Amino acid sequence: HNLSIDGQPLSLAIYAEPTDPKALLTSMVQASQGGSAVLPGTLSLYRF
Amino acid sequence: NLAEMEKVWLERDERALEVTRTVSLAQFYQALSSDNFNLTEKLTQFLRE
Numbered sequence: 001h002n003l004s005i006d007g008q009p010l011s012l013a014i015y016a017e018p019t020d021p022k023a024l025l026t027s028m029v030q031a032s033q034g035g036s037a038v039l040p041g042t043l044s045l046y047r048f
Numbered sequence: 049n050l051a052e053m054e055k056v057w058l059e060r061d062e063r064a065l066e067v068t069r070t071v072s073l074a075q076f077y078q079a080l081s082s083d084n085f086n087l088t089e090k091l092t093q094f095l096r097e
Contacts, residue, residue, distance in 0.1 A: 045061045 002010050074087040 042059060044058055045063060046058075 004010060077085055077087050
């Protein structure tokens with residue numbers, strides 16, 4: 001199994017180091033919005 | 049609340065018919081159906097006694 005007489009390994013291992021931290025972002029979300037509608041107006045008694 | 053009051057006043061405002069009535073008390077008293085009398089006669093009587 002390729003060890004020393006004392007049992008120490010004779011090969012150096014590797015691990016393929018994990019790939020960095022991860023950055024997370026947020027965004028503003030807008031939805032369709034409407035406006036008010038108008039109704040017929042009354043006739044007051046006073047002048048303009 | 050004041051704005052609501054003003055709005056209801058404006059929406060229910062109306063120009064009123066302006067009428068005049070002339071009421072002569074002597075004629076009104078004489079024309080009474082049940083309990084009538086004469087204004088001048090009764091006044092003169094109540095003044096003399």
